[PDB]
């Protein structure tokens, strides 16, 4: 029974939402090894936890950069939510803390790398491969949405492949607990729903739009709407005209027309039957939703793993000193972190 599972899941989440974890480690408990990845204003490092010997991924945020980009509320959101959630395809936050200069979120290290790099290297995924991933996102969104959470940053760069070949969603930077509508222009351009772009107000159905983009991109090897500049991308999205590769199944194309639907009254995920319109679509007919939840399905691809702190599934990045001022910065701003 999904109903009962989700009901208890909400109880668990709310407890943590109401009284969040805080200050569960400190910087000198870790040796910093190397950068795994970056975003517009964050850096993630592979690190080794001294007393356990375990490896982790440490997301480092410079408080002054957070502020300068007006991302305070988003960042508080990110940590508040991440610390509260619990789902098989969501990355685990293991520790969090702050110091004079930075905020830290220490996650489980997902050593298989970004879906992005595999996708680009391989070129595209078969429909069964794409479907395997897609199913995970469907369930994750079912989970998140049920808690009044909107994710808002679905993309291959934010999806990690684990040692079993299953997905782990990372980057809750734009996650928000909202009942009804919100207005922030945030996300990644190729993935933005038309209603985000048009400053209309929008709800959780943007996540379902993004799922469409994701499936297309996984299946095609390129996104449904691309161009050299974000503004050209926005024009295309807003037109909503979509073309599909020759090799796309009929089933696939039908699903995507219903996900990349510019009309909210028509978009799958946002109808009377909700996620069930997606789950019961012919394209997912072969999907055993429970088996997926339980991680019992055989993964199409399992990343090569060589030891505990192997990073060979990740690109190399330019390193920089992790500076900590002797003066506390933005103390008030980040009190609850």
């Amino acid at each position: 029974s999904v109903k009962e599972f989700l009901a208890k899941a909400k109880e668990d989440f709310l407890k943590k939402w109401e009284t969040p974890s805080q200050n569960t480690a400190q910087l000198d408990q870790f040796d910093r090894i190397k950068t795994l990845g970056t975003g517009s204003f964050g850096r993630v490092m592979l690190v080794k936890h001294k007393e356990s010997g375990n490896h982790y991924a440490m997301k480092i945020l410079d408080k002054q950069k957070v502020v300068k980009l007006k991302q305070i509320e988003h960042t508080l959101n990110e940590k508040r939510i991440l610390q509260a959630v619990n789902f098989p395809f969501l990355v685990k936050l293991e520790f969090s803390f702050k110091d004079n200069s930075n905020l830290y979120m220490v996650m489980e290290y997902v050593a298989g790398g970004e879906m992005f790099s595999h996708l680009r290297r391989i070129g595209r995924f078969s429909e069964p491969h794409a479907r395997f991933y897609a199913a995970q996102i469907v369930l994750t969104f079912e989970y998140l949405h049920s808690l009044d959470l909107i994710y808002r940053d679905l993309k291959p760069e934010n999806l990690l492949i684990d040692q079993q070949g299953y997905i782990q969603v990372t980057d809750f930077g734009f996650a928000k607990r909202v009942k009804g509508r919100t207005w922030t222009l945030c996300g990644t351009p190729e993935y933005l729903a038309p209603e985000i772009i048009l400053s209309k107000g929008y709800n959780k159905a943007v996540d379902w739009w993004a799922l469409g983009v994701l499936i297309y991109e996984m299946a095609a090897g390129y996104p449904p709407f691309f161009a050299d500049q974000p503004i050209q991308i926005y024009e295309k999205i807003v037109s909503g005209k979509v073309r599909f590769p020759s090799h796309f199944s009929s089933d696939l194309k039908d699903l995507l027309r219903n996900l990349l639907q510019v009309d909210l009254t028509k978009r799958f995920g946002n109808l009377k039957n909700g996620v069930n319109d997606i789950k019961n679509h012919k394209w997912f007919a072969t999907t055993d939703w429970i088996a997926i939840y339980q991680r019992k399905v055989e993964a199409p691809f399992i990343p090569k793993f060589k030891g505990p702190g192997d990073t060979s599934n990740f690109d190399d990045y330019e390193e920089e000193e992790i500076r900590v001022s002797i003066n506390e910065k933005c103390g008030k701003e980040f009190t609850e972190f």
Partner: peptide
Amino acid sequence: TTYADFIASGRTGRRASIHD
């Protein structure tokens, strides 16, 4: 081809978030 046009475009690497 669309593939070729994508590959030749400026947005084939990792994409950063936007937040206005």
